[PDB]
Design a protein around this motif. Structure first.
Motif, short mmCIF file in Angstrom:
data_model
loop_
_atom_site.label_atom_id
_atom_site.label_comp_id
_atom_site.label_asym_id
_atom_site.label_seq_id
_atom_site.Cartn_x
_atom_site.Cartn_y
_atom_site.Cartn_z
N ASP A 206 -1.66 9.24 -6.88
CA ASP A 206 -0.73 8.70 -5.88
C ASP A 206 0.61 9.44 -5.84
O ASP A 206 1.59 8.89 -5.31
CB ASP A 206 -0.51 7.20 -6.12
CG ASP A 206 0.58 6.92 -7.14
OD1 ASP A 206 0.67 7.69 -8.13
OD2 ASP A 206 1.36 5.95 -6.96
N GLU A 207 0.71 10.66 -6.37
CA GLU A 207 1.96 11.41 -6.30
C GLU A 207 1.69 12.87 -5.99
O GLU A 207 0.74 13.47 -6.50
CB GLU A 207 2.76 11.39 -7.60
CG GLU A 207 2.70 10.11 -8.37
CD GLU A 207 3.31 10.27 -9.75
OE1 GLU A 207 3.83 11.36 -10.06
OE2 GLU A 207 3.27 9.29 -10.51
N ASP B 70 5.80 9.28 -4.19
CA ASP B 70 5.05 8.41 -5.11
C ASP B 70 4.73 7.10 -4.41
O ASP B 70 5.64 6.36 -4.03
CB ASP B 70 5.86 8.16 -6.38
CG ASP B 70 5.05 7.48 -7.47
OD1 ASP B 70 4.31 6.53 -7.20
OD2 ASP B 70 5.19 7.90 -8.63
MG LIG Z 1 2.55 7.63 -9.62
#
Ligand SMILES: [Mg+2]
Ligand SMILES: Nc1ccn([C@H]2C[C@H](O)[C@@H](COP(=O)(O)NP(=O)(O)OP(=O)(O)O)O2)c(=O)n1
Ligand SMILES: [Mg+2]
Length: 424
Positions: free
Chosen positions: A114-115, A12
């Motif tokens: 974003d993960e 993350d």
């Molecule tokens: Mg995230």
DNA sequence: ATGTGACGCT
DNA sequence: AGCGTCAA
């Protein structure tokens, strides 16, 4: 069964949109700063917050005028705006940078911008043969915390003492020990996070465990710029004081009903109930899932999927700006359709696929749901004027106004989403 | 007046 | 086919 079959990690990115802007503008690095959209209302809505600004209490969704009251020195970067709409292209391209690096190490499931989850089981087995027999030095794990350790002065000394205790007790001679596999998994994630930072400049956190829920939970334990190993053995103490809402998928209505119906607060308290009892209160699927999860067991696979399945474009029209004329609806549908067409054409060139369905969604004034109405139609040509006309066609009969050029009830949101992709 | 995606239930 | 839930 103990759910120790896999090594799974969740990576993350730390304050992701902030880092993208700080890379581009060095004057923002190592400063309290935030990313904002739509400067004209209360200075803009805050969407991402550096850790320096978080220490002042700045949060997502806060108005920038209000953030400045908590943090007078706060610096701001504005999202790009195109056709009157916030444009997130910069952050999607930064996401692709990161996902392509992670994909070199293992098959990833893109979980968000974003993960990404990663199933490291195979990479771990291979590394165990190459680093066969040789112990794992603490210098291979420079940013790893072992959850629950040390047991039995400053933050970094704590980290290393717990890592020393972990490594001192590790059975290296048994290539099937789940704890050894997690540890080797953590070595790889160190290498993965180093590669991300070297090749993008972006820092991230990671969790390493035996499933996605524990990896996600582990990731947040020592964020930012650190990774956390949550072993099977650490679960009972970790869950004994873990609020139910913190476990992925229990943060909403189901989680609140688990709390209210059973009279409990912490994840570990779920162990007192039979699987049948939990199935009776929450359903066969949820009940089975809770029974295993509160023992640290979960079987949801890391799906091999690096690309979004839908490509969507929405704009809100709050309060007084709610769309109230047919000409307004048509013009904003065209604006959204033009951005969608740009994204779709890039997607067809980049990823050899084409969306075949267009879903149109609207929100009417006063409805607390995100979507008041959803209709679909065929997506046959990436043409913005055709897409907007078709979108208007499928929703035009929601108009309750006796006057033709008016639109009633007013629309507080329009949403176009391309979906049902097939090879091209 | 906050402003993307993935999947379940029907 | 269309709505509801959950998370970034
Ligand atoms: Mg995230
Ligand atoms: N509701 C939300 C949550 C996140 N985002 C954007 C901004 C985030 O920087 C980016 C990543 O989301 P996030 O991981 O939940 N938070 P962020 O990465 O900023 O901080 P961390 O706590 O992960 O360090 O998605 C958004 O636009 N709307
Ligand atoms: Mg993040």
């Amino acid at each position: 069964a103990t759910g120790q079959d896999r090594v799974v990690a969740l990576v993350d990115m730390d304050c992701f949109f902030v880092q993208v802007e700080q890379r581009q503008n060095p004057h923002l690095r190592n400063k309290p700063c935030a990313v904002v959209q739509y400067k004209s209302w209360k200075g803009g809505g805050i969407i991402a917050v550096s850790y320096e600004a978080r220490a002042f209490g700045v949060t997502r969704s806060m108005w920038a005028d209000d953030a400045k009251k908590l943090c007078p020195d706060l610096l701001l970067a504005q999202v790009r705006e195109s056709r009157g709409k916030a444009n997130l292209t910069k952050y999607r391209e930064a996401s692709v940078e990161v996902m392509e690096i992670m994909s070199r190490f293992a098959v990833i499931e893109r979980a968000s911008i974003d993960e990404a989850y990663v199933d490291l089981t195979s990479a771990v087995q291979e590394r165990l043969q190459k680093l066969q027999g040789q112990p794992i030095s603490a210098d291979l794990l420079p940013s790893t915390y072992i959850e629950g350790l040390p047991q039995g002065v400053q933050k970094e000394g704590m980290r290393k003492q717990g890592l020393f205790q972990w490594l001192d007790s590790l059975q290296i001679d048994n290539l099937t020990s789940p704890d050894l596999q997690l540890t080797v998994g953590a070595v790889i994630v160190e290498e993965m996070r180093a590669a991300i930072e070297r090749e993008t400049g972006f820092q991230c956190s990671a969790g390493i465990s035996h499933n996605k829920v524990l990896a996600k939970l582990a990731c947040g334990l020592n964020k930012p710029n650190r990774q956390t190993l949550v072993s099977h053995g650490s679960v009972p103490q970790l869950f004994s004081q873990m609020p139910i809402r913190k476990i992925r998928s229990l943060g909403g209505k189901l989680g609140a009903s688990v709390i209210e119906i059973l009279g409990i607060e912490y994840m570990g308290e779920l162990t007192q109930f039979t699987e049948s009892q939990l199935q009776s209160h929450f359903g066969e699927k949820n009940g089975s899932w809770l029974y295993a999860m509160c023992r640290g067991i979960e079987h949801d696979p890391v799906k091999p999927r690096q690309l979004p399945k839908t490509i969507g474009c929405s704009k809100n029209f709050p309060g007084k700006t709610a769309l109230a004329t047919r000409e307004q609806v048509q013009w904003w549908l065209l604006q959204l359709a033009q951005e969608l067409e740009e994204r779709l054409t890039k997607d067809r060139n980049d990823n050899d696929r084409v969306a075949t369905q267009l879903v149109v969604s609207i929100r009417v004034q006063g409805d607390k749901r995100l979507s008041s109405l959803r209709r679909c139609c065929a997506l046959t040509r990436y043409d913005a004027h055709k897409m907007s006309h078709d979108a208007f066609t499928v929703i035009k009969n929601c108009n309750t106004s006796g006057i033709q050029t008016e639109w009633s009830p007013p629309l507080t949101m329009l949403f176009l989403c391309a979906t049902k992709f097939s090879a091209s």
